[PDB]
Amino acid sequence: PDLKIEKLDEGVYVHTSFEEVNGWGVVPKHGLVVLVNAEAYLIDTPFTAKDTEKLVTWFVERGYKIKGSISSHFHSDSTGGIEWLNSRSIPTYASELTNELLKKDGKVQATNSFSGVNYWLVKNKIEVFYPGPGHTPDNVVVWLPERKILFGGGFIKPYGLGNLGDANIEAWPKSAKLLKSKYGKAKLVVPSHSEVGDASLLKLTLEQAVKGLNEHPQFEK
């Protein structure tokens, strides 16, 4: 299924790429393209080199140069395009924790890394926030202050925590509480697979996290 690009707000697009899960079916993965000063920043990179190339070239050829990409966590649904981006010397970014996990997993790393609670990828325009470990030990979210849009990625799991292989279920509630207190002001929250929502996704996630500690989508009901 082809890469999709849909307008979310002025200068904010959702890119949707797709992975086949053999024992289930096809799953959508959302990232963003954010336009700042007629220049493009990737928020998460499509699974494959081919879709990353397609996305990038799509913007570049029409006059919006790719300035960089930020990957929100180490899973390939967020980092699959880092190889291609690096091969073209397009700046790639990910936290130190994310790069360390990529290194351990024998994956190509972002060329640029950062640490701390807040990192401004683009001053006043694109902020990276680390709420603490959750869906993965390294997960971060990306805040766009001008549109009040939060890309939550894999941390935002409003309707089920999903793959717990790499999750920190002990810390996830505290992290989710922090995120919720931090970005209750968001107008839109963008999860990796679930539908774009409002700030209510922050609370649902918390609930999930909590319930989880008490111990693809699942459509059976």
| Catalytic hit among 15, 30, 75, 193 | 75
Spatial contact of 36 and 70, defined as CB atoms under 8 Å apart: no
In this complex, which beta carbon is closest to Zn ion, that of residue 67 or of residue 194?
194
The yes-or-no answer on residue 166 being catalytic is: no
The yes-or-no answer on residue 73 being catalytic is: yes
How near is the Cβ of 136 to Zn ion at its closest, in Å? Answer: 6
Rg of the chain on CA atoms, in Å: 16
In this complex, which beta carbon is closest to Zn ion, that of residue 117 or of residue 164?
164
Spatial contact of 39 and 65, defined as CB atoms under 8 Å apart: yes
Long-range contacts, 24-27 (Cβ 8 Å, 24+): 24/216, 25/216, 26/1, 27/193, 27/216, 27/217
> Site map for Zn ion, 19-58, x if CB under 5 A?
----------------------------------------
Cα–Cα dist 185/51, whole Å: 33
In this complex, which beta carbon is closest to Zn ion, that of residue 51 or of residue 138?
138
In this complex, which beta carbon is closest to Zn ion, that of residue 152 or of residue 154?
154
> CA-based angle 165:96:217, to the nearest 5?
30
Residues linked to residue 127 through DSSP beta bridges, in sequence order: 120, 143
**Residues in binding contact with Zn ion, number by CB under 5 A:** 2
How near is the Cβ of 60 to Zn ion at its closest, in Å? Answer: 28
What distances in angstroms separate CA 119 from CA 8, 94, 122, 139, 182, one per listed residue? 23, 10, 9, 13, 14
How near is the Cβ of 139 to Zn ion at its closest, in Å? Answer: 8
| Interaction residues for Zn ion, span 75-94 (CB under 5 A) | 75
> Site map for Zn ion, 131-160, x if CB under 5 A?
-----------------------x------
Spatial contact of 45 and 36, defined as CB atoms under 8 Å apart: no
Please tell me whether residue 125 binds Zn ion under the rule CB under 5 A.
no
Q: Give the residue among 184, 179, 121 at the shortest CA–CA distance from 155.
A: 179
The yes-or-no answer on residue 75 being catalytic is: yes
In this complex, which beta carbon is closest to Zn ion, that of residue 11 or of residue 131?
131
User: If DSSP states are collapsed to H, E and C, what string results for 142-169?
Assistant: EEECCCCEEEEECCCCCCCCCCCCCCCC
The yes-or-no answer on residue 135 being catalytic is: yes
| Catalytic hit among 15, 30, 44, 73 | 73
Residues that bind Zn ion (CB under 5 A): 75, 154
Residues with a known catalytic role: 73, 75, 77, 135, 163
